[PDB]
Amino acid sequence: NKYKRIFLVVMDSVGIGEAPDAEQFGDLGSDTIGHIAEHMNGLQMPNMVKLGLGNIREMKGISKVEKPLGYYTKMQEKSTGKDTMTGHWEIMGLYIDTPFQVFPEGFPKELLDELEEKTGRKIIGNKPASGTEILDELGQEQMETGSLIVYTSADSLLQIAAHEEVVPLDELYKICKIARELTLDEKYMVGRVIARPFVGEPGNFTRTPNRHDYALKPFGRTVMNELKDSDYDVIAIGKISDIYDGEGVTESLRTKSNMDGMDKLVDTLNMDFTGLSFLNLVDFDALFGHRRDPQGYGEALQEYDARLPEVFAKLKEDDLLLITADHGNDPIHPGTDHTREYVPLLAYSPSMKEGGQELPLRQTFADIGATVAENFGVKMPEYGTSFLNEL
Ligand SMILES: [Mn+2]
Ligand SMILES: [Mn+2]
Ligand SMILES: [Mn+2]
Known part of the structure; x- marks a missing residue:
């Protein structure tokens, strides 16, 4: 060499x-x-x-x-x-x-509809946000309804947040894998799906190290x-x-x-x-x-x-x-x-x-x-x- x-x-x-x-x-x-x-x-x-x-x-x-x-x-x-x-x-x-896509106004309804339909769960949020702002905003609703918080960033990401005492981790990882399949689709092509589990109570939510990523x-x-x-x-x-x-x-x-x-x-x-x-x-x-x-x-x-x-x-x-x-x-x-x-x-x-x-x-x-x-x-x-x- x-x-x-x-x-x-x-x-x-x-x-x-x-x-x-x-x-x-x-x-x-x-x-x-x-x-x-x-x-x-x-x-x-x-x-x-x-x-x-x-x-x-x-x-x-x-x-x-x-x-x-x-x-x-x-x-x-x-x-x-x-x-x-x-x-x-x-x-x-x-x-x-085939380019990876970004979603500044949120994800398309057709994608979020198919994720609901495969999971049995409702989706809330659907906008770019930091982990902290989105949990402050929606963590409490998530806890009370079993709904999934779906957010994005400025990069090609789909992030799914859920409280570990409301949505078991294993179920959240299953959900993220379903989302990872749905997003191998050029209309909705995201680089990375990320599981964002969190714990705590309103006013004091913390993302946990049980984050898992699903890349292509x-x-x-x-x-x-x-x-x-x-x-x-x-x-x-x-x-x-x-x-x-x-x-x-x-x-x-x-x-x-x-x-x-x-x-x-x-x-x-x-x-x-x-x-x-x-x-x-x-x-x-x-x-x-x-x-x-x-x-x-x-x-x-x-x-x-x-x-x-x-x-x-x-x-x-x-x-x-x-x-x-x-x-x-x-x-x-x-x-x-x-x-x-x-x-x-x-x-x-x-x-x-x-x-x-x-x-x-x-x-x-x-x-x-x-x-x-x-x-x-x-x-x-x-x-x-x-x-x-x-x-
Ligand atoms: Mn430009
Ligand atoms: Mn770069
Ligand atoms: Mn970037």
């Missing part, structure tokens, strides 16, 4: 400007990094700048450098949707025609599958295992925040493995993008960039670091949905003794998967063009 270890970091939702098909998605004008940089009166990201971020695209506080540490370009998404599953699936070698497998065997089947390590950090429903994962490390994700990245640098270490930094999407909070997003980007020198210090001559994103989520854009954007790509190894150069624009995210597969000598994905020999 040219590289013994590859460290792939998805900065979740960190877009670098409107894609050529943004108009189809109502995403004209979008620019996640750009708008944040203007809000911050200059983003302070000196380490991403040293890698070549401003060589991809100059933005406020983010300038090009003469000798970038590694190679740089951007990537265009080929898949139909702009959700997290689509983007990640494409990164690992797939093409996804990727629509194809990914590069991760091929790695795992060839006895490589595939270390998933953060939401990566959930995103691929475990497919192809040999070890999974839960994280609680972006700093904790960078700590687990560092833990993997200290491991003797051969294969892929794959990190998702989700806070950018979950806390700041969907909440349309440019200040919080800005601070988080700065906090991330400050962790990078330690990663540079630990990379070996036969390691490769890849940094990208899975879509945009511009915190100064209408609504609460993602944005259809190009994503940055940075590729760095300390064996790059002269620094890097510009790569041709990657016409699918699957170029990353193709690179990884070529590096490790495993079956090449159906989609994607490796840039391994360009490095």
Whole structure:
């Protein structure tokens, strides 16, 4: 292998400007990094700048450098949707025609009607809400009627809440499995069904750790599958295992925040493995993008960039670091949905003794998967063009 270890970091939702098909998605004008940089009166990201971020695209506080540490370009998404599953699936070698849907006004009546009809239970709520607001609002009614509280988020989720002393857990998991079948339907395609059991009394409801998720497998065997089947390590950090429903994962490390994700990245640098270490930094999407909070997003980007020198210090001559994103989520854009954007790509190894150069624009995210597969000598994905020999 040219590289013994590859460290792939998805900065979740960190877009670098409107894609050529943004108009189809109502995403004209979008620019996640750009708008944040203007809000911050200059983003302070000196380490991403040293890698070549401003060589991809100059933005406020983010300038090009003469000798970038590694190679740089951007990537265009080929898949139909702009959700997290689509983007990640494409990164690992797939093409996804059928988008996952989001439900800001609630789920369609036809779906909720069929869930009632299969379960024998009435549904209440049916809107985007936090766990806390929805339980305050409807927890008491739920307790008194046996009804199911159905809510959503700004992401592709269907969440079903019920009190553990009113709806037994096993019954709630059965209900979520029925909902998971009903939502494999392109009219209603949700990424994840989540059981949200709770306990307590009105005024004091708490969600319990008995949460269970019902995800879809990727629509194809990914590069991760091929790695795992060839006895490589595939270390998933953060939401990566959930995103691929475990497919192809040999070890999974839960994280609680972006700093904790960078700590687990560092833990993997200290491991003797051969294969892929794959990190998702989700806070950018979950806390700041969907909440349309440019200040919080800005601070988080700065906090991330400050962790990078330690990663540079630990990379070996036969390691490769890849940094990208899975879509945009511009915190100064209408609504609460993602944005259809190009994503940055940075590729760095300390064996790059002269620094890097510009790569041709990657016409699918699957170029990353193709690179990884070529590096490790495993079956090449159906989609994607490796840039391994360009490095
Ligand atoms: Mn939009
Ligand atoms: Mn995402
Ligand atoms: Mn999201």
